[PDB]
Amino acid sequence: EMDLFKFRFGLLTKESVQEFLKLNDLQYVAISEDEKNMHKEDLMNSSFGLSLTKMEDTEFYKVPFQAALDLVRPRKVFLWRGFAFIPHKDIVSIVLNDFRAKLSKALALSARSLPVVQSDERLQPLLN
């Protein structure tokens, strides 16, 4: 399942990606334009190899710093008030982590709810 999910994420355009990150209340940023202008210089000096105009053409996301460990640790993303401002490869990893947690929990619950299904002969030859 994880493999499949990763592939599908790899095929998502940035817009679609953000849509997904919103629909599931993952809330990984998206900063406003006004706040972006507010921290323009900080953002410019935060992201490596980002040009002024090209930066104007890009939108960042706000994430709790506990999820950007690999970025913060070498100081390649600006931190302000406990949130990192991450531009538009690693994110899939965090998403997958969440997914895996959830899925494991779900499987446990399903194994806990097995007796109700074994009585349905129709579905026993298949599932078993």
Partner 1 sequence: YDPASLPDVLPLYYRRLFPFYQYFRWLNYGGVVKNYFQHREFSFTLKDDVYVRYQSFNNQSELEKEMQKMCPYKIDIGAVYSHRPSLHNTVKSGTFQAQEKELVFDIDMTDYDDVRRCCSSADICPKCWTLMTIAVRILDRALAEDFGFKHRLWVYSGRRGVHCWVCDDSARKLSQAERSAVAEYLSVVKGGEETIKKVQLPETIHPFIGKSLKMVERYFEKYALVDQDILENKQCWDKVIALVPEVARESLLREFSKARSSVERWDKLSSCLEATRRYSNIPKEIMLQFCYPRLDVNVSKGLNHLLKSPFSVHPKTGRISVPIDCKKLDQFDPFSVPTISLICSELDNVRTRDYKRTSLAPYIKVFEQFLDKLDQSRKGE
Q: Which residues pair with 64 in a beta bridge?
A: 83
Name the residue nearer to partner 1 (CB basis): 47 or 99: 47
> Which residues contact partner 1 by CB under 8 A?
41-42, 45-46, 48, 65-66, 69, 72-75, 78-83
- Least Å distance between CB 36 and partner 1? 15
- Least Å distance between CB 63 and partner 1? 13
Q: Where are the beta strands (DSSP E) in the chain?
A: 61-64, 79-80, 83-86
* Contact status, residue 50 vs residue 58, Cβ threshold 8 Å: yes
* Contact status, residue 113 vs residue 56, Cβ threshold 8 Å: no
Name the residue nearer to partner 1 (CB basis): 18 or 46: 46
- Least Å distance between CB 48 and partner 1? 7
Name the residue nearer to partner 1 (CB basis): 16 or 66: 66
Name the residue nearer to partner 1 (CB basis): 17 or 58: 58
- Least Å distance between CB 88 and partner 1? 19
DSSP 115-128: HHHHT-GGGHHHH-
* Residues 16, 42: Cα–Cα separation, whole Å: 27
